[PDB]
Structure of Macrophage-expressed gene 1 protein:
Amino acid sequence: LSLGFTKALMDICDQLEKNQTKMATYLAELLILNYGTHVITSVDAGAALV
Amino acid sequence: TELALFSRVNGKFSTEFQRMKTLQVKDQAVTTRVQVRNRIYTVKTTPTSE
């Protein structure tokens, strides 16, 4: 994983250890905002014309 | 008109009237629209941005 995603996960983990669900949820929603919902494991490089 | 009296007095009278008229009109209307829109990147800010 990239540095940024790992850091986001570590932030969420440490905030979870503090037994604070409100901030953990907020950080999770920011996580899915910044890094989307699904992760792309394939793209087909191509071109198209109409 | 042609008239002859007594086989000696001749009289001729020839009239001609020509009236020509020519009208013409030519309206023309060309109308062009070219539109070009072009995207070459989408550039976004990294989540690990200070």
